[PDB]
Amino acid sequence: DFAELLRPLRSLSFNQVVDRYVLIPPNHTFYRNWTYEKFLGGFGLSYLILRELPLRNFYARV
Amino acid sequence: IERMTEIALHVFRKARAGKVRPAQDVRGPDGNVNDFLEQRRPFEHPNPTGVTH
Numbered sequence: 001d002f003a004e005l006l007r008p009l010r011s012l013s014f015n016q017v018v019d020r021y022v023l024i025p026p027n028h029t030f031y032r033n034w035t036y037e038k039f040l041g042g043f044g045l046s047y048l049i050l051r052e053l054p055l056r057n058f059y060a061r062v
Numbered sequence: 063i064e065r066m067t068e069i070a071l072h073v074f075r076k077a078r079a080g081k082v083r084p085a086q087d088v089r090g091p092d093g094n095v096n097d098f099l100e101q102r103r104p105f106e107h108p109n110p111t112g113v114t115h
């Protein structure tokens with residue numbers, strides 16, 4: 001398993017490793033925080049659907 | 063005209079009460095005492111605005 005962690009490196013040279021994983025071209029235009037906005041924002045969207053539960057008893061929905 | 067009016071008004075009051083409770087038998091419009099026993103909301107139409115208990 002320690003040799004499996006280095007599997008994608010054995011097929012590459014050092015120059016290819018640096019260009020592949022180290023020298024990623026700079027691009028600061030992405031909305032990186034969309035991952036959190038989708039996750040935490042899902043609580044509000046889930047509430048919009050959940051506030052319509054056809055459970056007749058009020059205390060059941062409580 | 064006073065006597066004619068109170069005759070028509072008495073029929074009107076019974077006919078007006080008959081709209082909410084129609085006449086099924088000889089008893090006439092709104093002549094059933096069982097309608098005024100304890101009633102509950104139907105299962106498909108509960109109290110929409112407030113708590114029941």
Ligand SMILES: CCCCCCCCCCCCCCCCCC(=O)OC[C@H](COP(=O)([O-])OCC(O)COP(=O)([O-])OC[C@@H](COC(=O)CCCCCCCCCCCCCCCCC)OC(=O)CCCCCCCCCCCCCCCCC)OC(=O)CCCCCCCCCCCCCCCCC
Pocket residue numbers: 038039040041042043045046049050
């Ligand atoms: C045509 C006739 C019908 C034929 C088809 C019939 C079959 C239909 C099913 C297949 C089609 C489904 C379509 C979507 C495909 C999804 C495929 C999938 O794998 O999903 C698995 C999906 C996700 O699994 P999961 O990984 O465990 O994520 C849920 C975790 O809770 C997550 O928890 P977390 O902490 O890890 O993360 C928090 C999470 C937020 O998660 C929560 O907070 C929810 C927590 C639940 C409440 C807590 C109480 C939990 C109680 C536990 C017991 C629950 C049992 C419920 C069983 C429900 C069975 C489905 O936030 C997020 O991660 C991102 C959320 C934002 C996502 C963006 C929203 C996109 C949704 C799609 C939009 C378009 C659809 C139309 C609009 C919706 C309909 C009006 O499983 C679910 O279904 C979860 C329940 C969601 C409620 C579903 C209600 C919508 C149903 C729509 C039906 C059609 C509309 C009505 C049409 C009527 C006329 C026909």
Ligand SMILES: CCCCCCCC/C=C/CCCCCCCC(=O)OC[C@H](COP(=O)(O)OCCN)OC(=O)CCCCCCC/C=C/CCCCCCCC
Pocket residue numbers: 029030031032034
């Ligand atoms: C949200 C309001 C919608 C209506 C808007 C009306 C007003 C119109 C005026 C808009 C002016 C536009 C100003 C510029 C806004 C810029 C938008 C922005 O910054 O985010 C874009 C950004 C681009 O992402 P990147 O690729 O990382 O960045 C590349 C940048 N070139 O978009 C995103 O991140 C995605 C999230 C955006 C909102 C997504 C909406 C999701 C709603 C889900 C409902 C759809 C149903 C889904 C069903 C799923 C079925 C499998």
